[PDB]
Design a protein around this ligand. Structure first.
Ligand SMILES: O=C(Nc1ccc(Nc2nccc(Nc3cc(C4CCCC4)[nH]n3)n2)cc1)Nc1cccc(C(F)(F)F)c1
Ligand SMILES: [Mg+2]
Length: 266
C-alpha cells in the first residue's frame, strides 16, 4: 500500500472552491495518471464538527468498487489539510449536459437510469449512507457512463448550481419533508424525479415558490407533457408513490419494459 504526499502530484486548474477547501484537476507526477484532488481544510471540518463523519465517509468510499460510483483512490493529510485522491470524470456533470441539450431522448435517459439503478443496488447491498442524488451529483466518465459523486453528508459541494435557490427540494420525497423516518426506498423516488427531469427538462414538482413545491410533493401532484411516452409514464408513475412501500424494487426498474427496450446498456 502506497503512502501518498502532495509532492507526488502535479496540481492543475481548480475544478471547484468553497468554504471547506478546493478541488483540482491533477496528475500523478511519475505515471501521469490524470485524477482529481480534493483538498479540505482541517480547521473548517473541525469548526463544523464533521471531521469524524468525513473520515468515516472516506473510509467507506475507499473500499467501494463500482463502475458507476466515483472511485476514491486514496487519501493523505498534512498539518492543516486532508487530501482525497479521486477519479477524474472527463465529460462533466449530467447537470451541465441537461443544460446543453435541454432534454434527453429515451435512449440516453433509459441508459442513465439503468446505470444509476445499478449503482444504487450496489449502495444498498453495502448499506452506503448517501444524500439525495441530483443531476449535479452525476458525473460522466470517458464512455459517457454515469458516475455518482459528492454523495457524503459530511461536507456540501461548493457548486454554483445557479437555479433558483438550493435546488435540492425538487428531489426530496414526501416522507423526508414530512419528517417521517425514511429508508432505502427514497432512492426509488429520486430515480422517478430524475427520469422525469431527463425526459422533460425540469423536475415534476417544480414551482415558482418553494411553498408550492412542498404542497405538490406532499400531494404527488404533477403532470406529464404530451410527448412523454406510455412506457416512460408507467415507470415514473410507479416510482413517484407517496407511500414508499408502494415503490418498486430496483430490480423491477432494471427489468421494466421501457428500460429494457431503450437502454443501450443491458
Ligand atoms: O467540488 C466538488 N465537486 C465537483 C467539482 C467540479 C465539478 N465539475 C466538473 N466539471 C468537469 C469535469 C469534472 N470532473 C470531475 C470532478 C470530480 C470530483 C472532484 C470532487 C468531486 C468529484 N471528478 N471528476 N467535474 C463537479 C463536481 N465537491 C466538493 C465537495 C466538498 C468540498 C469541496 C471543496 F471544499 F473542495 F470545495 C468540493
Ligand atoms: Mg431546471
Amino acid at each position: 500500500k502506497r503512502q501518498w504526499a502532495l509532492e507526488d502530484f502535479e496540481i492543475g486548474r481548480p475544478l471547484g472552491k468553497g468554504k471547506f477547501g478546493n478541488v483540482y484537476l491533477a496528475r500523478e507526477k511519475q505515471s501521469k495518471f490524470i485524477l482529481a484532488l480534493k483538498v479540505l481544510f482541517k480547521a473548517q471540518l473541525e469548526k463544523a464538527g464533521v471531521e469524524h463523519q468525513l473520515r468515516r465517509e472516506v473510509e467507506i468510499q475507499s473500499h467501494l468498487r463500482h463502475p458507476n460510483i466515483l472511485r476514491l483512490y486514496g487519501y493523505f493529510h498534512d498539518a492543516t489539510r486532508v487530501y482525497l485522491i479521486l477519479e477524474y470524470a472527463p465529460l462533466g456533470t449530467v447537470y451541465r449536459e441537461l443544460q446543453k441539450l435541454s432534454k434527453f431522448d429515451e435512449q440516453r435517459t433509459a441508459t442513465y437510469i439503468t446505470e444509476l439503478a445499478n449503482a444504487l443496488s450496489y449502495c444498498h447491498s453495502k448499506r452506503v449512507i448517501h444524500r439525495d442524488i441530483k443531476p449535479e451529483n452525476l458525473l460522466l466518465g470517458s464512455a459517457g457512463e454515469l458516475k455518482i459523486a459528492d454523495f457524503g453528508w459530511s461536507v456540501h459541494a461548493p457548486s454554483s448550481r445557479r437555479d433558483t435557490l438550493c435546488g435540492t427540494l425538487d428531489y426530496l420525497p414526501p416522507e423526508m419533508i414530512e419528517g417521517r423516518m425514511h429508508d432505502e426506498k427514497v432512492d426509488l423516488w429520486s430515480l422517478g424525479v430524475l427520469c422525469y427531469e431527463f425526459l422533460v427538462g425540469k423536475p415534476p414538482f417544480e414551482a415558482n415558490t418553494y411553498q408550492e413545491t412542498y404542497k405538490r410533493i406532499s400531494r404527488v401532484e404533477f403532470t406529464f407533457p404530451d410527448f412523454v411516452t406510455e412506457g416512460a409514464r408507467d415507470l415514473i408513475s410507479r416510482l413517484l408513490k407517496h407511500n414508499p412501500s408502494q415503490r418498486p424494487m430496483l430490480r423491477e426498474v432494471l427489468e421494466h419494459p421501457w428500460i429494457t427496450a431503450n437502454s443501450s446498456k443491458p
